[PDB]
Design a protein around this nucleic acid. Sequence first.
RNA 1: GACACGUGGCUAGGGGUGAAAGGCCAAUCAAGUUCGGUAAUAGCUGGUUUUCUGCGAAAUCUAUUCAGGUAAAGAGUGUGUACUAAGACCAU
RNA 2: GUGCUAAGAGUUACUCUUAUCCUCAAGCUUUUCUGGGACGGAUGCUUCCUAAAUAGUAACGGGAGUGAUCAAUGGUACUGCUACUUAAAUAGAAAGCAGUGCUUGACUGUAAGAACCACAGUUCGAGCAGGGACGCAAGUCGGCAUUAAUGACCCAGGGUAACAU
Lengths: 53, 438, 98, 133, 64
Amino acid sequence: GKKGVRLLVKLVSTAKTGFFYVTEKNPRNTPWKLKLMKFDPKVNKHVLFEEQK
Amino acid sequence: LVASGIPSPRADVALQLSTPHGGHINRMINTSESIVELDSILYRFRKRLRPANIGAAAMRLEHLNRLERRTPYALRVQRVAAELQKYVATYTDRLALTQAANVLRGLSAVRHRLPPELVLRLAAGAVADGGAALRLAPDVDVRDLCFGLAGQGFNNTAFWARLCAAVLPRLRSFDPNTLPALVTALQAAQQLPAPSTPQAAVAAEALRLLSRSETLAALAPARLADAASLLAGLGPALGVAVDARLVEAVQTATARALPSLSPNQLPGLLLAVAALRRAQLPAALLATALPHLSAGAVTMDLTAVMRAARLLAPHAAEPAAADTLVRLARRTLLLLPAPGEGLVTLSRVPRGGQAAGAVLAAAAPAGQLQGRTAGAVEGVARAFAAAAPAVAPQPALVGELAARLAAAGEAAAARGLLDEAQLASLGRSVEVLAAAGA
Amino acid sequence: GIIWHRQANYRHARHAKSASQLTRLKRWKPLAPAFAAKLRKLGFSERYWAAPDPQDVPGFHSPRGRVERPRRSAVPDMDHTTGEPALRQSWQPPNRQR
Amino acid sequence: XXXXXXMKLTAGELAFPGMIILRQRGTKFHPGANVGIGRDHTIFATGVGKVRVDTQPGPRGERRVVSVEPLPEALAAADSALRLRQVEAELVKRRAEVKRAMLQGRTPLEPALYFPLPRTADGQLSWLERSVA
Amino acid sequence: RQKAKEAKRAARAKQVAEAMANMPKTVADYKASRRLDWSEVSALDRXXXXXXXXXXXXXXXXXX
RNA sequence: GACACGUGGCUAGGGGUGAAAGGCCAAUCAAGUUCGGUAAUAGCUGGUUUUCUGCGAAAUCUAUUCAGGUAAAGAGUGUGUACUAAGACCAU
RNA sequence: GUGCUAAGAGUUACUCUUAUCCUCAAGCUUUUCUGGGACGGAUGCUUCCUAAAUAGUAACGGGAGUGAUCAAUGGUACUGCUACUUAAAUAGAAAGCAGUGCUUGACUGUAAGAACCACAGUUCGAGCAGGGACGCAAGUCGGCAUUAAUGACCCAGGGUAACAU
Ligand SMILES: [Mg+2]
Ligand SMILES: [Mg+2]
Ligand SMILES: [Mg+2]
Ligand SMILES: [Mg+2]
Ligand SMILES: [Mg+2]
């Protein structure tokens, strides 16, 4: 809702080729840039994914 | 997945069917895995069938009838055969040698005989030239044509002369396992006389091709059984001789091709090599083929248990031969109806594809009494009267075996399938078994 | 002769759906028999998603166009007076004609 | 809505892999041999066999354990795990052929399009076309 | 035009190969920045997860 | 007399005229009459014309600018296919 | 469109072009359920009673919820203690209460078979391939004990890939 500040945001790969994961995040409770190791099908190896809008 | 109980589309079948290419009806025929499935495909496209589709339908009817273990005289098979016979009569001069060979082999292996003027048209269309049809067609088409025309009657002996004159220069370029079908087709008609001469010449050159080493070790299994039978039946009459090179090659390749024969093919091959050594069963070959004979006796039809019982007739005192023979005794007890089924029930017989006729072979095994098994109960009776001391340890078993042999003989004599000589031999064998049974 | 279509509920909002649900919605399903019967009687015989261009075949090319202009097509059409009688129950008379 | 939640296949009913045996809210019935359990505690069969419902001692009280007992003609045609998988595969293939024979070509089983092969990945069978480098 | 297309394909292949070579250092940097079990918020030390959140948020503000 | 009458004339329809009443404008005027578009439109009402024979429902359910309309499912008929059944009862 | 107005332009008051307040003349809209209509109330989804011991079952019939939260409240492997966990029902020696060590399976491509069901959709799903996580292993992991938090298509926008100009 409008009171709930949690939004959907995008996780862009470090490797290249722009594969991404869209996952939700709380801005207030997480002012990190969200970084997780996820599978990248273009390279078929796990790489890192930082948060960009 | 349409509606949760309807089968989801298969992967390779959807990949094969979704093409820009033509050939949809033949691909639907080739993915039909049972009989009225094929009949519904022939019903859906009955205003759309062409000669290629008729050839594919005949071949698929042949394969699906052999794929189950149900008789070719079933009403479903005969209806599909007559429906294809209508289109064969429509396109009787348009069919090329591929399609004519397809429809002839497919309608002969389901034992549906065409009208003989149609067979005459379909063979004269194969030879209405300077033999040019039989020189542009591959070896499998000639094999299927010969197998189809060995059925449907048609022992014309003038058509066969020009066919054998056309196939004789091309025969050494053939793949070496289509040769036994050619020799069997020549023997199956009234050709190869004195139990004209280009037929005997091409049979002799085919058996000269089959007799050699380095190919006889390269035939497929169950083709070496027919090749060994043809050699043992036609060696001294026309072709190759007694010589131990051939018998050594046959025994060596038989020791390698043992597991790849179905249990209905093993005793034919072993009687073939027994006839080969008389032109016997040598050491350390029976001791490795007999575990296969015991392991194949659980699923083995009654003429095959004849051939195995005749094979194990001249020696019974050996314990491995003895319990193999009591395994065949229990098998013959199983598939022959009681004089008074209970294995499976008749209400649950599959209408499906895989071995549905085998389930119908159990669940009241009466009704499988055709003429082949009608003479074959007499043959099995003789073969078990020959093998006394192997089964005679079991008194009640051989007594019930004699009861079922006598019951089947009386029933099939009532059906008109036996005569007085076979009845007398059956009576002698059943009184020998019943005297041994008490 | 079966009429096939892609499954709906897959264009957007894929974050709120499970992995199995998204895998299930990628598949195609045949139309229901009643709807398929109406389309078959209406005369629907489309063998391709879009018509293949007669150009782009080797040897069959424009005399002066390097290729051609594609013109991406839209799919909205519903009015109770003029377009798509299939998408309206009745016909509405026009608005006074000036 | 309707939310139908009951037991679909009773005890002594022959089951095949994937068939839902019971649908419940919470583990009223607990999974046993040759039986899987879903997210919503749906009990589904992972082997060909007759369903058996037996009661066993439990942590709170009288646990009911739902199981699938394999056929006695299976485990005789079957190291053992590979042999069972081969026997189950043939039974599953036979079931499909019998079902296709009983539904006499009156349902739309396979795509058969006039199009180029339905989109195929290296694995194949994708109803999703994806452009390749 | 195809020469420009192959040049773009080679350039993107080159950058993905270089980043894939650099990539083990990037996961090690991320894993080290999340790891906190050394040099705690103070010399008090006295509870592991409580000390593994305040420093992590302080490092997140430092590494923002 | 802010009168009445007679004879021609002028203002005409989304317009005229009105000491103003939704009044009058050739006996149906909050939009004249006639002709044309026009065989307008009407999920509404009414009606549908010779005979015999066989079979024979439904008024539930879901969706709907939709609940007096429509479409799908259920229940009907003809045709095809196929089981001693994907059927009905009864017993254990 | 119409009347004034604004800003440019022409013959050089008048006329043209463009725009827009306030007037005049029009053209279009202005749902539905309802023991009549109006008024009031409601229109998704989940649970409990009706609902009659498979399932299912109505009424502006009766009582609680919900349009989320959480980078841990996810996954995996463990450590202590024992009457709670929640919207209700079914359940739970952990699916409860406090903790830890690593991690992102809160994946990529699929999936036989079923529940359900007018259709669209909805629900479970063993198994296979890839690359990974935890665990000595056994083996689990395609978000959270489940049932709510899931708005088609069109249109518009973004990343990437192929073809084209
Ligand atoms: Mg008018
Ligand atoms: Mg009624
Ligand atoms: Mg109604
Ligand atoms: Mg919502
Ligand atoms: Mg785009």
